[PDB]
Subunit: 151 residues, 3 copies
C-alpha cells in the first residue's frame, strides 16, 4: 500500500556542565549536550525522520517540554495526517562514553513514546574512529530512518 | 509490491561570486555553492537517492561535464532526467524526504518553494515531497559556514 | 506487507601499511583502512543497516572484537553471517543502497565488483544492490584524505 520513508539528522556540542541525555536516558559522563532543553540528539533525529515520512516539514516548524513529549506530539500529528509507524532505526555517533549498556532503555523509551512493539525500534552506536569534532569528543551526532504507511 | 529504498548525500563549498541555489530556489546570500553547474546540493542528493533506489548507479555516472546534452544544464534539468531514467527502468516514485544542513542563511522562508519545485520536476503531489533544514551547531566546516550538506531518502516501487 | 527500513554509518582512518579493502575489493593503493578486522567501511555500514532493519541491534553486538576470529576478519564473512541471522529472524532482504565518500583513490573502476560481492553475500540479484561514490568536495577530514566514510540503507520484509 501507501508506504513512505523519512530520514533524520541531529548534532549537539559536548561540553562540561550539562547532563548527558540520549534517547531519554541519563548517562554518566563528565560532559553533556548543549541545546534548548534536554538536547536529546537521538530523539530529535527520530522526530525529524517521522515528520519527514509524513511530509509535514520539520521539528522546528512544529516546535518553535522535553524531547519525549515532543516525540509523542510528533507521533500524534503523524497519526492525524493518516499515517501508521512501521519501524524506526537509528545510529548514535559518540567517541565516548560506552552506549551499549543503555541501548535497551533507549529502545524502551522510544517504543513507549511511539506506541510501537519493541521489535520495530532499533538504536545502534558508533565511534568516529577519532576523526573530526565527533572523534575528538566535541559533539555527538544522531541519524534516524523511519518507515510509515498511510492507513 | 516491489518497493526499493535509496539514500543520497552531497556537499559543496560556499564561495564568493556565485548565486546560492538550493532546491531550485535562488536565496539572497553573499556566497554560493561551488560546482560544475549551479551546484544545487539538495537536488543532487535527491538525484543520488533516486538513482540508488532504482539501482542505476550514481549521479556522476549519468551526467558528465563532457556530454553535450548536459553541459549547460541546471540541476533541475538533471533531476528531471534522473526521473526519466528511473521511469525507464520500470520504477515509480513514491516519496522523497531530505535535510539541508546549513549554518546560514535562514532557509525556512524558502522551503515550501523548494518542495513545489521538486514536486513539479518529479511529477509528484506536494504531499509526497519533504524538505527539512538544520544548522550544524557551529561544529566543523558546516558550522563554520564553509559548505552546505544535503541528505535525501527516496522510496520507489517497480510496477 | 511487513516492510522495514534500516540505515548504517561507518568511518575508518586511512593509514600506510594496510590493504585498502572496500566492498570486499582489494584496491591498489599506498594506504589502507585501519581497524581490528579488515576494516571494510562499506560492508560494515551495510551490515549495520541490515541489523537495524531487523531490529537486531548493531554489528558490535553480533561480532565481538573479543572473538579471536575478529582480528583481520573478512568483512564479507561477517556480512554473510549478518544476512543469515536476518533470515533466521524471519526477514527477506529487498534492496541495498550505499555511498562511499573518499577523496582518493578513484573508486569508479571498482564499484561494479563491490556491487557483485554484496549481491553474492546477500543472495540478491545485481539489480537490487547499489553502490555510489562521492568525494567530499575537499571539505573536512574526508577532504584531507584522513579517512573514508560509508553510508547504507536497506529494505527488508518480514515473511
Ligand atoms: N539554515 C537553517 C537551518 C535551520 N532552519 C530552520 O530552523 C529550525 C530549527 O532547526 C527548523 O525549522 C529549520 O527548518 C533554517 O531556517 N535555516
Ligand atoms: N573517490 C571517488 C569519488 C567519486 N568517484 C566518482 O566520481 C563521480 C563524482 O562523484 C561519481 O560517479 C563517483 O562514483 C570516484 O570514482 N572515486
Ligand atoms: N559510544 C559507543 C560507540 C560504540 N559502541 C559499541 O561498540 C561497537 C564498536 O564500535 C559498536 O558496534 C557498538 O556496538 C558503544 O557501545 N558506544
Ligand atoms: O558472532 C561471532 C563472531 C565474531 S567474529 C566472527 C567471524 C569472523 C570471521 C569469520 N566468520 C566469523 N564471528
Ligand atoms: O566488535 C566490533 C568492534 C568494532 C567494530 N567496528 C568498528 C568500526 N567498524 C567496525 C565492529 C564490531
Ligand atoms: Cl574494524
Ligand atoms: K556526517
Ligand atoms: Zn537536537
Ligand atoms: Zn553536488
Ligand atoms: Zn568499520
Amino acid at each position: 500500500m501507501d508506504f513512505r520513508i523519512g530520514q533524520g539528522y541531529d548534532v549537539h556540542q559536548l561540553v562540561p556542565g550539562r547532563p548527558l541525555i540520549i534517547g531519554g536516558v541519563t548517562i554518566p559522563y563528565e560532559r553533556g549536550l548543549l541545546g534548548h532543553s534536554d538536547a536529546d540528539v537521538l530523539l530529535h533525529a527520530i522526530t525529524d525522520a517521522l515528520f519527514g515520512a509524513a511530509a509535514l516539514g520539520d521539528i522546528g516548524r512544529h516546535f518553535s517540554a522535553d524531547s519525549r513529549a515532543l516525540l509523542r506530539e510528533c507521533a500524534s500529528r503523524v497519526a492525524q495526517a493518516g499515517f501508521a509507524i512501521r519501524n524506526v532505526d537509528s545510529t548514535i555517533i559518540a567517541q565516548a562514553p560506552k552506549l551499549a549498556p543503555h541501548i535497551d532503555a533507549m529502545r524502551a523509551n522510544i517504543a513507549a513514546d511511539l506506541d510501537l512493539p519493541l521489535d520495530r525500534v532499533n538504536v545502534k552506536a558508533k565511534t568516529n574512529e577519532k576523526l573530526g569534532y565527533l572523534g575528538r569528543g566535541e559533539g555527538i551526532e544522531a541519524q534516524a530512518a523511519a518507515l510509515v504507511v498511510r492507513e
